[PDB]
């Protein structure tokens, strides 16, 4: 009834256990097989290897496990850059966030889950950001 996507922060909060409630919430999202964008996967890999210094082998294995069983990667859309340029005029965010939103919308995603994106804001009348942890 509504295609749902996620950002890196959701999977990070899942991976982090300092915050039991937020980790629980993020894992609760993942029980719904939410969609996701490949750029989210790449950014997750980078953050894993930089902040947490985890091994390349372990990070790759976990990426494969999650992409196989829990979540669903979204095929990169060739119209991502043109649309992102279209979104930039009306929207002033980080180009990375703009790219994520561009790909999510181009895949008909109806809800995007993230914190640092001015929650509740509607992007081009096609996708409303939802902040779940509140």
């Amino acid at each position: 009834l509504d295609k749902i996507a996620i950002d890196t922060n959701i999977l990070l909060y899942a991976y982090d256990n300092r915050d039991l409630d937020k980790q629980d919430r993020a894992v609760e999202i993942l029980l719904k097989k939410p969609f996701v964008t490949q750029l989210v996967v790449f950014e997750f890999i980078k953050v894993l290897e930089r902040r947490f210094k985890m091994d390349k082998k372990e990070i790759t294995k976990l990426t494969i496990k999650l992409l196989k069983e829990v979540i669903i990667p979204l095929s990169l859309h060739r119209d991502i850059y043109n649309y992102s340029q279209f979104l930039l005029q009306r929207y002033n965010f980080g180009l990375s966030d703009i790219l994520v939103l561009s790909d999510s919308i181009l895949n008909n995603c109806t809800i995007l889950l993230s914190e640092d994106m001015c929650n509740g804001m509607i992007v081009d009348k096609k996708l409303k950001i939802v902040n779940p942890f509140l």
Partner: protein, 1212 residues
């Protein structure tokens, strides 16, 4: 010495250009460049602009806009009716429930199609007015027709009944909306014509034709009599079609001064002439002595099969509808209290006019009757004011400083020629120009009758009293007669003589009961202003009466005199009122002349001129002309030129000549060019493209440096218009500022003639080069025809010359079948020096010797002209064989549009009407999205539908074009059966079966062709077609409308390639392009469903290169070594459909022979264009083509080291 010469040849939609560096004295030189720019235009435009038939895109856009405007205003009227009725509590509850009254006022709620009278309960529709239906059935039974009729016919029964009986309020609302639907014909001005205005549609029979003994053209013209006792105004020759013939005319009768009717005649055809049909219907309704509604009702009682809409009453004067509605409303106001509730009237007024207190107050004095007819249903807006578009004075300006800290000029509008001031100015001018002559010896007899100021005062006094003057009146004035003298103007012509004041004085004289001094100059001006500014009947009469009250004049004969004053003709002078007021004092003489009436500056100039002192604002030509103006009293009776100079200090328009110093001036000129500024769009487009091409050439070959182009030549070959304007504009580039070159056009501009061009071409052998160039097409046509009639051997030249058989020689011309002849003509023109044009335009010498020098300098020994240089033919061939035709493209799909609408804005605690801009992004679609015909979707079980295709059916008239094959395409099977039976009964001949007489007979006897089972008459039948038609829209019933792509909208043709290498082709619908461009995305998707990457997209007029069969062009580039072979493999896209893309070689303009279904031959087969190359290899172009990009001058563009570097150097 070295001269840069730029030759231009301008066609209807083509611009050939050549640039040469010639040194004629030494017979040296070389062709620097050559090319042709093509503006695509269909042959229909070329063949229609000669005669003219709405040949303009702007006119078509305006037509659509007007249609849309009428539709929108009707919808607004309906919504206002909805609001008013809902407040009045008249609408039925089920109907009112579905209409928005809060946000989208009066409109139906989204995705709803409510019907006022049909109530939907649990999926069943029931009629609302049962008792009225029963009454109508009772009336029908009384008429003895039938008892089974559609429910909706009750509307007319109610319309009849409301006139003298009470009806339910919902019925009244239905009636009112029905009236809103049909408003009738009405003309804004009105101006009831001749009180009789007979204009009566009558049908007369010819009694006899007494030959009138009027022998004309070897035949005696007969007269005509009518049983009524009327004689036809015009005589007749063809007796066969007149004797005892029942003809119908529209006769106009006017009571002539003798006291008798001056009946006129005008032949008309009923059911074919708008006026005839309208007048016939009006007369028929009037004779019945009843309102249109009851006329329709009774016609329906008599003939229950009658067609009402479009057949019985199409269009009639709005007075009928207004009278019927007034009667109905007045009668119903006697019964329904809500129509008498002042509270409800105020409520409705506030609802409609919450923000217009003035109009609210004005309406508060009226009643519901006025609100319903005058304000809501029958409110027609007046014409927009065109006064803003009037021309401006050439003399008086004003200067003011805006909020931007600039100082810009406002213009003064011209004076309406009917103005008394302009009349006086013109009369003085004519007086000064007048001068008499004697018939006998033709001597300037004047200066003896108009020699002292008294004579001129007498003449002016005489002229004022009149409205026009002529030979006899003017000669008789001086006591002179015709038999000795004349007046230097057209002997039989009349001239305006201050008709404004005349007419005013005459209508003031008819009023009587006033002293013969009321009409003074001030009162005259006031009356003229009243007549000119109040162009409205009611306003005009109110203004008349008010004027008659303020001035103590009996308003009894005054309005009678002035109520029928003819409106002034729309025409304006060159100068404004201010300039005319300034110039009149200088022009006047005698008692009408007084020194104090000259403004301060002009008086200062007069003092300076008489003094003879020195002023920078006064020229030497002044004192030369003003030698006689010694004293102030010499400043009397000054002609236009003298007074003009004195008032403003310029000897008329001296022009500015101007001189452009670089391409920047030209590009500014182009930027500030205004649309619709010339004769027609075609010449404007040609001129603007010519200027752009000239700028490109200047930049490329001279860096836009000053005086780079030594000389420019022009040729055209109706089109004459662009001959002088282009020369004048381009004079600014090739001018000389030393003073030698002065005039309308620079002396360096050298227009040519076809004589020089053709004679140079023949003498110079360029004809031979052209024949050689075009010959291969003619051998190809020979092969195609398997004959040898398209090429003829000649022994004088010992070669084949191209030719066409006589049958294919209707309008063939060897030159027009290509695009490069424009460039050839440009080259010919560029080398034709001023000597050549002078020699061949004035070859008449009066002596062999004087023109012998030009002969020797320019003609070989008079046989032929010398070449500009030794290798001219070789250079021309080599350049012509390497010319890429550049085509202008129009790929507009969406473009931003601005909307400003009136609205009440709240500022400083006040509501004020002003223009607010529309917010959000509002695009305008710059192409027709679909064809006009709309078809419905059908499912026929007895026809196979392949996947991806649908059946769509549309109504068509049954005519002779229905054969068995076509008869097999009707959706209905009973109709197919009946039609087949009828056609078989008619020997299987549709021409006989489905003629109008045949169709009438079939409708009469439908039993015999339907197994004896009854059947409704057949007039139209739904024919189906299997194809791919898309929905018009997605809201309401628009999903039920299926249409086809509009002509010339398959603008994009995508080509993808997979990893393997095979190519995929697609045609993108215009709609998808619209969404993609709205989203900021590219027009063509960069990847198809299979994931094949997009190689590129093609659009009409795009240029592609098809490599040779052996060539492997994967990363070729190197688009600079373009030889005749490479250029010969360049094609231009023409049209697209599905996966098919048609091409034509770039250098081809017109086919040697087109395709005819009978002979079945053409230069490029049935489509006049091929999907493959024309060469023997005949390879699929789309399979190996590569797109190329060319500029206005026809130079290909390919990525290079410098290009790539710059790509992100611009960003660095």
């Amino acid at each position: 010495m070295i001269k840069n010469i730029l030759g231009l040849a301008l066609g209807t939609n083509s611009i050939g250009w050549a640039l040469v560096k010639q040194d004629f004295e030494n017979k040296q030189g070389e062709i620097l460049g050559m090319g042709s720019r093509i503006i695509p235009m269909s042959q229909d435009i070329l063949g229609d602009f000669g005669k003219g038939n709405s040949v303009s895109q702007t006119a078509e856009r305006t037509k659509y806009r007007s249609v849309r405007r009428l539709r929108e205003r009707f919808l607004l009227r309906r919504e206002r009716l909805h609001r008013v009725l809902y407040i009045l509590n008249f609408l039925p509850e089920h109907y009112a429930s579905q209409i928005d009254f809060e946000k989208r006022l009066g409109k139906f709620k989204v995705e709803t199609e409510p019907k006022l009278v049909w109530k939907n309960t649990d999926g069943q529709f029931s009629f609302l007015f049962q008792n009225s239906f029963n009454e109508m059935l009772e009336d029908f039974k009384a008429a003895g027709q039938e008892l089974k009729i559609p429910y909706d016919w009750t509307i007319y029964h109610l319309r009849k009944k409301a006139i003298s009986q009470k009806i339910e309020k919902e019925e009244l609302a239905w009636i009112l909306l029905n009236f809103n639907h049909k408003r009738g014909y009405y003309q804004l001005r009105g101006e009831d014509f001749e009180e009789e205005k007979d204009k009566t549609f009558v049908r007369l029979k010819v009694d006899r034709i007494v030959d009138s003994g009027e022998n004309v053209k070897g035949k005696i013209l007969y007269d005509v009599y009518f049983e009524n006792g009327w004689k036809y105004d015009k005589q007749v020759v063809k007796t066969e079609d007149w004797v005892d013939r029942t003809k119908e005319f529209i006769v106009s009768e006017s009571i002539l001064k003798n006291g008798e009717t001056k009946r006129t005649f005008k032949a008309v055809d009923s059911e074919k002439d708008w006026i005839a049909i309208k007048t016939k219907t009006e007369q028929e309704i009037e004779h019945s002595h009843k309102t249109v509604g009851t006329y329709i009702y009774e016609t329906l009682l008599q003939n229950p099969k009658q067609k009402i809409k479009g057949k019985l009453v199409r269009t009639i004067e709005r007075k009928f509808y207004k009278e019927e509605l007034r009667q109905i409303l007045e009668k119903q106001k006697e019964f329904h209290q809500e129509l008498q509730s002042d509270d409800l009237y105020n409520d409705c007024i506030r609802e409609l006019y919450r923000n217009n207190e003035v109009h609210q107050l004005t309406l508060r004095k009226k009643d519901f009757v006025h609100l319903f007819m005058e304000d809501i249903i029958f409110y027609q807006r007046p014409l927009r004011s065109q006064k803003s578009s009037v021309s401006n004075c050439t003399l008086e300006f004003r200067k003011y400083k805006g909020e931007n800290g600039a100082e810009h000029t406002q213009y003064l509008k011209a004076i309406p020629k009917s103005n008394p001031y302009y009349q006086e100015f013109r009369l003085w001018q004519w007086i000064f120009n007048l001068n008499l002559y004697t018939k006998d010896n033709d001597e300037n007899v004047t200066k003896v009758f108009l020699n002292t100021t008294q004579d001129f005062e007498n003449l002016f006094e005489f002229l004022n009293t009149r409205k026009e003057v002529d030979q006899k009146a003017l000669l008789k004035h001086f006591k002179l007669n015709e038999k000795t003298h004349r007046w230097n103007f057209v002997e039989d012509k009349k001239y305006p003589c201050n008709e404004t004041k005349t007419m005013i004085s005459s209508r003031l004289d008819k009023v009587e009961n006033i002293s013969d001094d009321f009409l003074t100059r001030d009162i005259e001006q006031k009356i003229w202003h009243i007549i000119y500014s109040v162009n409205d009947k009611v306003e005009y009469e109110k203004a008349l009466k008010s004027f008659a009250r303020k001035h103590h004049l009996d308003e009894s004969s005054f309005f009678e005199a002035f109520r029928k004053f003819p409106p002034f003709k729309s025409e304006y002078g060159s100068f404004s009122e201010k300039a005319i007021k300034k110039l009149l004092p200088l022009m006047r003489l005698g008692k009408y002349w007084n020194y104090a009436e000259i403004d301060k500056y002009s008086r200062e100039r007069i003092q300076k001129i008489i003094t003879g002192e020195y002023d920078e604002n006064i020229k030497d030509k002044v004192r030369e002309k003003s030698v006689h103006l010694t004293i102030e009293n010499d400043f009397q009776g000054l002609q236009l030129w003298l007074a003009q100079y004195i008032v403003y200090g310029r000897h008329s328009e001296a022009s500015m000549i101007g001189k452009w110093n670089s391409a920047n001036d030209l590009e500014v000129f182009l930027k500030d060019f205004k649309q619709h500024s010339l004769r027609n769009p075609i010449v404007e487009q040609v001129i603007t493209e010519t200027l752009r091409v000239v700028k490109d050439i200047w930049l490329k070959y001279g860096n836009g440096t000053k005086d780079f182009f030594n000389e420019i030549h022009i040729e055209l070959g109706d089109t004459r218009y662009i001959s002088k304007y282009i020369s004048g504009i381009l004079s600014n580039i090739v001018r000389v500022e030393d003073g030698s070159d002065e005039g309308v056009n620079s002396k360096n501009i050298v227009p040519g003639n076809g004589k020089i061009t053709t004679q140079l071409k023949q003498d110079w052998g360029l004809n031979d080069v052209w024949n050689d160039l075009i010959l291969p097409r003619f051998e190809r046509m020979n092969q195609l025809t398997n004959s040898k009639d398209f090429t003829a051997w000649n022994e004088n030249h010992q070669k084949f010359l191209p030719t066409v058989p006589i049958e294919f020689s209707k309008g063939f011309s060897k030159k027009r079948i290509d695009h490069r002849h424009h460039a050839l003509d440009a080259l010919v023109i560029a080398c034709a020096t001023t000597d050549h044009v002078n020699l061949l335009n004035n070859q008449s010498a009066k002596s062999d010797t004087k023109r012998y020098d030009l002969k020797k300098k320019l003609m070989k020994f008079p046989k032929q002209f010398l070449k500009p240089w030794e290798k001219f033919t070789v250079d021309a061939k080599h350049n012509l064989e390497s010319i890429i035709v550049s085509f202008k493209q129009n790929l507009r799909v969406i473009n931003k549009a601005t909307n400003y609408y009136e609205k009440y804005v709240e500022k400083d605690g006040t509501k004020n009407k002003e223009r607010v801009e529309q917010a959000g992004t509002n695009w305008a679609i710059r192409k027709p999205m679909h064809k006009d015909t709309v078809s419905g979707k059908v499912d026929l079980p007895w026809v196979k539908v392949p996947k991806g295709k649908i059946l769509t059916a549309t109504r068509k008239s049954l005519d002779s074009s229905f054969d068995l094959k076509s008869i097999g395409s009707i959706t209905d099977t009973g109709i197919q059966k009946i039609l087949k039976n009828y056609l078989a009964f008619k020997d299987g001949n549709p021409e006989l079966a489905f003629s109008p007489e045949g169709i009438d007979d079939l409708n009469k006897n439908i039993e015999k062709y339907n197994d004896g089972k009854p059947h409704q008459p057949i007039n139209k039948v739904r024919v189906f077609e299997l194809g791919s038609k898309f929905q018009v829209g997605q809201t309401g019933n628009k999903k039920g409308k299926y249409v086809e792509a509009a002509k010339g909208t398959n603008l994009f043709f995508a080509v993808y390639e997979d990893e393997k290498g095979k190519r995929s082709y697609e045609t993108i619908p215009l709609n998808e392009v619209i969404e993609r461009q709205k989203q900021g995305l590219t027009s063509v998707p960069l990847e198809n469903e299979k994931g094949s990457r997009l190689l590129f997209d093609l659009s009409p007029n795009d240029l592609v290169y098809v490599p040779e069969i052996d060539e492997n062009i994967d990363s070729n580039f190197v688009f600079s070594n373009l030889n005749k072979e490479k250029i010969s493999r360049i094609y231009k896209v023409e049209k697209t459909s599905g996966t098919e893309c048609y091409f034509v070689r770039q250098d081809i303009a017109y086919l040697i022979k087109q395709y005819d279904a009978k002979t079945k031959i053409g230069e490029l087969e049935s489509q006049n264009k091929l999907q493959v190359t024309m060469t023997d290899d005949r390879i699929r172009i789309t399979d190996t083509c590569v797109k190329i990009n060319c500029d206005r001058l026809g130079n290909i563009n390919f990525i290079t080291k410098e290009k790539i570097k710059q790509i992100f150097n611009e960003f660095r």
